[PDB]
Amino acid sequence: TCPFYKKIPGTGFTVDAFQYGVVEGCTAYFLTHFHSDHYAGLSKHFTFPVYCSEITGNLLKNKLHVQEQYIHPLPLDTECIVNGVKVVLLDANHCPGAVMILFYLPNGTVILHTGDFRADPSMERSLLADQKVHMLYLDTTYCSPEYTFPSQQEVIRFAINTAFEAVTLNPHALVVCGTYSIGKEKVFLAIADVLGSKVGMSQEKYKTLQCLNIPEINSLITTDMCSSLVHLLPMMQINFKGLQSHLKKCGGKYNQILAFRPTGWTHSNKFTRIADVIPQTKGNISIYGIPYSEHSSYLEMKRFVQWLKPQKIIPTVNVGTWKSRSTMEKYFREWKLEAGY
Ligand SMILES: CC1(C)C[C@@H](NCc2ccc(O)cc2)CCO1
Ligand code: NI
């Protein structure tokens, strides 16, 4: 059964609702981005219209084998009519191809669905600047004041400087970066760039990255592991056992591993500044956890909502417990009383 927060009232539309079978009354299924909790249920046998970005469409065709006749890519920042309703796709500042969706209902109501997003002041000068938004379907992943983390730029500076120092001290060190989905590509791309290397990876990950429209990508990535001193591995292998095993496979080319685990928020954010971050070390292997987020911090979320001034907010994350729902509702009321809407 499809939950209420994935339905758009006054339309035949659902958002990120592919795991519920045939949804009664749904004439078009929107997909905000290619993450598995959101696409769960899509396959080569799906036969309803899917609306999404160009990049998400490339991934549906090549990774999930969805037939081309059912994929409806839409350009960004452009008014489009879908089944008689005006819609606009906006960049969500999440992973590649991720969008927010503006729906202009026939009755005059305007709804914004953020999908997954990292709010930014640059959104205050998109097509959102024009008109009023009545209902907001909000990515509330980190909707609590304890969730603080640095800018993406600060985290990348730390990673580049750490990697460059380690490999300049020891030219026989290998750098490894963990991954389990699309997103956070800047971490491994920026490190490879400072080291003058391509990024080496499996055939399967190479395929995924070739779908993302990244400029000059053929110059940056490879399946030839022997040519590369920055390797990508599954996130599950970023531990002392898995990294030791990987080092064995490299044939005595390297004598040290420096590894990065790009997490979201972790409790050590409450204590430590990005500059003060230290690795876990065993012998010739060091592992850094770095807080590279593709979701809004609490303060970023608050600023966006107080600017937008929506009449009603519908959370799409942390909806499963009464304590979470009550906590989020108290913050939304605080924000409204402070700003005066
Ligand atoms: C050069 C600028 C500043 C213009 C900006 N265009 C509008 C926009 C802003 C934010 C969005 O999330 C979506 C669209 C994108 C790139 O950066
Ligand atoms: Ni996501």
Curated annotation (Swiss-Prot):
Q: Which domain of life is it from?
A: Eukaryota
Give compartment(s).
Nucleus
Reported induction: During mitosis. The mRNA encoding this protein contains an internal ribosome entry site (IRES) in its 5'-UTR. This 5'-UTR generally suppresses translation while specifically promoting expression during mitosis, when cap-dependent translation may be impaired.
Known tissue expression: Expressed in brain, heart, kidney, liver, pancreas, placenta and skeletal muscle.
- Record function comment: May be required for DNA interstrand cross-link repair. Also required for checkpoint mediated cell cycle arrest in early prophase in response to mitotic spindle poisons. Possesses beta-lactamase activity, catalyzing the hydrolysis of penicillin G and nitrocefin. Exhibits no activity towards other beta-lactam antibiotic classes including cephalosporins (cefotaxime) and carbapenems (imipenem).
Family classification: Belongs to the DNA repair metallo-beta-lactamase (DRMBL) family.
Provide the assembly information: Binds constitutively to TP53BP1. Binds CDC27, which is itself a component of the anaphase promoting complex (APC). Binds PIAS1.
State the name under which the record lists this protein: DNA cross-link repair 1A protein
What organism does the record attribute this protein to?
Answer: Homo sapiens (Human)
What does UniProt list as this organism's lineage?
A: Eukaryota, Metazoa, Chordata, Craniata, Vertebrata
Protein encoded by which gene: DCLRE1A
